[PDB]
Amino acid sequence: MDVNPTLLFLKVPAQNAISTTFPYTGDPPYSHGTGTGYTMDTVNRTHQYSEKGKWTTNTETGAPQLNPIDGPLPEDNEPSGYAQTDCVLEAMAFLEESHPGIFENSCLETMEVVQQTRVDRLTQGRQTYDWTLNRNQPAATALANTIEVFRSNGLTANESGRLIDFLKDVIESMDKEEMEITTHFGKKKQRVNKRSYLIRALTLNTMTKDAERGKLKRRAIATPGMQIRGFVYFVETLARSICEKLEQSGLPVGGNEKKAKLANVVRKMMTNSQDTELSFTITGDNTKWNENQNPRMFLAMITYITKNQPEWFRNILSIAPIMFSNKMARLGKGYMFESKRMKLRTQIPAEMLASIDLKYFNESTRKKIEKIRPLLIDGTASLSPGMMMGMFNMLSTVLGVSILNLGQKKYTKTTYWWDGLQSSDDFALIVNAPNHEGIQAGVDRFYRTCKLVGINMSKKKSYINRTGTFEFTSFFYRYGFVANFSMELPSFGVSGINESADMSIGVTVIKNNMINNDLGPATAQMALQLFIKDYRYTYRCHRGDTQIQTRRSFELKKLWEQTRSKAGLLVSDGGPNLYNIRNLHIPEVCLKWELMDEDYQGRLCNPLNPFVSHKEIESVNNAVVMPAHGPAKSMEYDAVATTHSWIPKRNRSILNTSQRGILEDEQMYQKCCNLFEKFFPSSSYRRPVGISSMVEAMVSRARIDARIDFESGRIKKEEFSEIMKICSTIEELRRQ
Amino acid sequence: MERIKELRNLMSQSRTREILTKTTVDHMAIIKKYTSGRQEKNPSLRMKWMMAMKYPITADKRITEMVPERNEQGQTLWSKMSDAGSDRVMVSPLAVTWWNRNGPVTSTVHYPKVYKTYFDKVERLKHGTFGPVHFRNQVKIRRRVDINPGHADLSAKEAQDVIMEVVFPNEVGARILTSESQLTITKEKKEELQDCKISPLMVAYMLERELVRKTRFLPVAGGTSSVYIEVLHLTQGTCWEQMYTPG
Amino acid sequence: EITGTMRRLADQSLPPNFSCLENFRAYVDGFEPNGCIEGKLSQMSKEVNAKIEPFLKTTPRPIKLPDGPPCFQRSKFLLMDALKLSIEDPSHEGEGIPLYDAIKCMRTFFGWKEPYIVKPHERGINSNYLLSWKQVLAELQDIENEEKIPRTKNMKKTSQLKWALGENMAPEKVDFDNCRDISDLKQYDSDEPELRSLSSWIQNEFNKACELTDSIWIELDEIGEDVAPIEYIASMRRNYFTAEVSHCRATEYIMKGVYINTALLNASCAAMDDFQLIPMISKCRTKEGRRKTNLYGFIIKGRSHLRNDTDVVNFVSMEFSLTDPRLEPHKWEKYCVLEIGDMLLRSAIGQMSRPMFLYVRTNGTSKIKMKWGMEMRRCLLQSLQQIESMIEAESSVKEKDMTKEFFENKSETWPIGESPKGVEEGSIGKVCRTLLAKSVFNSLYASPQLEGFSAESRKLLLVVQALRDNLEPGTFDLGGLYEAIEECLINDPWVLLNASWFNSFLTHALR
RNA sequence: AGUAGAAACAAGGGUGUUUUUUAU
RNA sequence: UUUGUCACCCUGCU
């Protein structure tokens, strides 16, 4: 007998066993070296998928740019990019008649957000492009640099803290002949000109994506900078407000909310006529989604959305499309050359890709360089006609939902219906007609409609069945949603925060998978046992009666010896496990409480130990996780702050660089912002305000305390003297 | 007073006066987060890799006056290096075990009251009775249920009101409390929280988690009540059903 | 307001018909939606449509497979060609000094010939493997002659060891200003891998991964004691399932992999500039009560200055065997096979004598790969969740627990393979043991080709199933799906077996 | 050699000190 | 080979 597992599908329906297909017990694919080649291929494919347009050189930047709008209609079935204007506008104007008043209420909702938001809220987010350093830096360490460079040249309006003023500062930075910037190479000074500054401020970063599952080839993604981020925030706010009011969308929700709407639409089209009709279901994707859809249509849909509104509103809402349509993409890191005869390897940067001799590259690289070469400007590359990942997602979903809305019965004019649900590229459609000649008419209408706005429907990843069975994203419908344990499998393990959060989020993911993903009792017990085993192995915390030689061993046995009740020691200390199905929603220290002796309780929960570190309130009992399909998420867990709540160490490969002056700074900032903690012990819970210096306040709230607690309650009168003495001394030392 | 002493020592040298008298107070929110480190994409791998290092965790410097260097057998318990961009020391995971082994003891009469919302679960589980098991169909509908009893009928505004009045009393700012319920909560916590040494962020967090309402989207097949939901994995399944009345 | 560089930047970023933003806004404002689309679908070419080609019972065709030299073994350790050297000692796994047990097991054997070379390696200088094996024993001797066996031994650095482990072989890093006038200076190679075709040993090796042994390999008992009835139901299901899977060889694979990757990662992080000697040691529980420890061979680690998650560390692997290589030499394309002694296993009264073999190889691993190798124990969950789902699906149409009879009193069978006479079926434990071996092999051979092939054959599966359920499927372009499935089949020995299995399923499903 | 696959790894940075001298 | 005789630090996502 030759065993073959696939034959199981001769008796078991496929959806009842689809978990057996996902090979998610191994490592995911990564990337090696540079991503310059992928970026060049992307630019060239973007300029190839539309080449029948107009070329012009922008006056300010001076770049060759293509305008593929209102170009010729397409003939064959290849991926086009020639979207119309009247089509977009009619889609919007029909969607607004469909949902009355959806735009005005959203604009009202967004105007307050505009008028009350403060600048500090830009310290949240992922890596951002820094043009002072020409690199990638976290959000706060880039906002500080851009503010320091803005206000060191005359541009001081952000001091009111509103973001609506930092915006005006970013704009009026664009009208200066010269700009001073410094470089930590002591330091230095350099003077950048107007158009060099424009190009440095209209630039994106590009790099290859890692740890992605389901594909054989690697791709590339982009990163914005500082001058564009505010207006992006604002338009995304508006688009999210709109999306949360549409039935046919699924983006701004979670897993459970989406499935209810899926079932709802399925049974909506299920039963209004039982015999004299016929339903079909289309599963599939869209192709080259973020290679088409240029900003010059986002501009028109924003101009339509914000109609009959104040003028500053429109002007603040229409700046991100303008910088997108004039963007210039970076290229990457360069290339590496090798000589087999003399054992030499060398790195060339992306700046030499407009002048280097071409006798070094293979055929693919030659034919990529020689086609991108008419666009290179000072490292960047003109990229006008497209988007790229890290973009306006909600607005794309809005356009798609507007396309789907066109298939109502009073619009199609004869018999045909189609409904569905969209969430970016993924779509699921359902068509109706009382015939087999009607289904093709409906599908042809839809397919030809989506070509007039730039949504090219893929044709090698889609299929068409009779209704009752489909697959939306990775969910599978067989008269009901079957469970898929393999997608959430890669999270059953140690997360790597500390010894206290791991135990909580482990049992928490076991519990949340029992509740929704339809796990089972025996499965959960075996998962418990395996998880305790790998926890004990990763943290060197085996039981205290064993012979397994590790390094917390000489010590743990000590705590094992001088202990009365050994069923109180936490698993982090070499003790038992009292977890089970019922005990699964209860914290550890709260469950072993009544069984510990007093010395252990005291020493463990001693609230002055030197390992506990609290920083703010947005990051207490909360940590980010990296799932298998999707972006990083935030998980909140229930723990009790104890000695095992510590923080790991930090990277230190920055000392060998020349940007060491980035450490000095931060250290001083800490040694300052810590003292402000103890003169004002409420700033980590609520944000402090004012426009006075940090020492005026620290001396104002230093004389009240000498006279009110230690001299209005009868404590010593001999310290008051020197307290006032040093307060006066300090308020003199500032020279004022 | 160490406060004014360290202030005067800061503003006595250069490089530290200009920062304190140039940085306004509405700006320290930005420079508090000025870091040269990155949020990590792969935490599991880094934990497994770092656990084999000699000094993987970080403690406050006060360790050097609270914990020795080499214990009874002679294993190092902390190092002589400073962390990247801070004044914290790099220490080994044996120091935690040591502190839990031969360390300073305290009192624990307040830990039940600060974490009441957990001990509710603890002594609600050990007072509950079981019954039969019905192996039958399970039809589930997805609804919106409150995953926390929601102590009061209030919202975020008066929540911050009561929290700042109870934890940060001399910095409430301007307004006073208005109704009777907030005063009652306030004074109850006033009395029962006196002489506490837990960090005030932890007290504020526990009062928020203990006093405000959270709602979620869940599949149910039995009864819609808040004390039932916390035990949901155990009561309902897809093919079976356990009977349970909590105490 | 907008004035300056932004007034012009906006006056360009428009449709190619306008040049002033104010007139653009004036146009967009007073636009009443007319029949634009419906009157523009009439000018498009009629060569853009969505033509349905009906999937019929005669439409599918066999996926095609590559051509070229046969495939070879790519695994960090031997799987079915393994021979243990075992002793008996009352221990638990993870408790003891490795080199001690190594020396004990090395003394258990009796016939140690002088070893020579059966099968040479073609691309590598061949004296070095023999000289390395003729040194591992000397270090073992001088650590048995020493007063207290440590937990680390550092090999001296000799010529053959650096050769095998690849030391001092990365090119030098010099600037472009200097080696700009040299010839043979060009890109790194970025070509497609070399194509290869299927062999026969991969199925024979998947067969052995489903059968039974005479030991116990997994120990799962540490949990809070029961209170409620559902606890007891789960604890009887667990009893039965763990009674079935505790003797499969996939469990031995899981263990022998977790141990190696743990030891190698810890040694890689500990010392970055020495050569360690790690043995492969396993510990099992015999039938009737006994407990044994068993040796598989040795691993020698080189230098590890690992910075990224894709930087490589090299190592030399030496394993024991009794399988002669000449029966299939193309399987062992990157091994140098020796003959290191004789072994006598007595018959009823007669005798059998057989030569004993050592397979040596140079191999390498990354930082991201050791981590995932240390997590091989989720295979159990993937394999048992499906069987629990089946059991709980049958025990809801009867209103009764059904786990009792499934494992001893069985009238249900599932088709699990096929034979010279046709398809055949098995009990529930057979399914449990084949899904587990599939889950183990999915991690022993991971690649981007597996990801691609799975993601693209999951579509054919669903169209075939919709055809089987009378749901009347269709398709827009069927050749492109096949071209995509065939893009991913290049040289990996396990994805090729998967494609052949898919051909077999396609044959039987639409026969 | 090997890892590996559309491009990389097989380590990467800085600090030194200097007109013939009689002896162990 | 070299004007040399020998040392020294640092870093492992920057």
Residue numbers in the entry:
A (entry chain B): 1 to 185, 206 to 756
B (entry chain C): 1 to 247
C (entry chain A): 206 to 716
Verbatim from the authors:
Influenza virus ribonucleoprotein complexes (RNPs), composed of the polymerase complex (FluPol), nucleoprotein (NP), and RNA, are essential for replication and transcription. In the life cycle of the influenza virus, the viral genome RNA (vRNA) or the positive-sense complementary RNA (cRNA) segments are encapsidated by a virus-encoded nucleoprotein (NP), with their 5′ and 3′ termini clamped by the polymerase complex (FluPol; composed of PA, PB1, and PB2), thus forming the ribonucleoprotein complexes (RNPs). We report atomic-resolution cryo-EM structures of mini-vRNPs in two states: FluPol located inside (State-In) or at the outer rim (State-Out) of the NP–RNA ring. In State-In, interfaces for FluPol dimerization or Pol II interaction are blocked, but fully exposed in State-Out. These structures reveal detailed FluPol–NP–RNA coupling and suggest a conformational shift in RNPs during the viral life cycle.
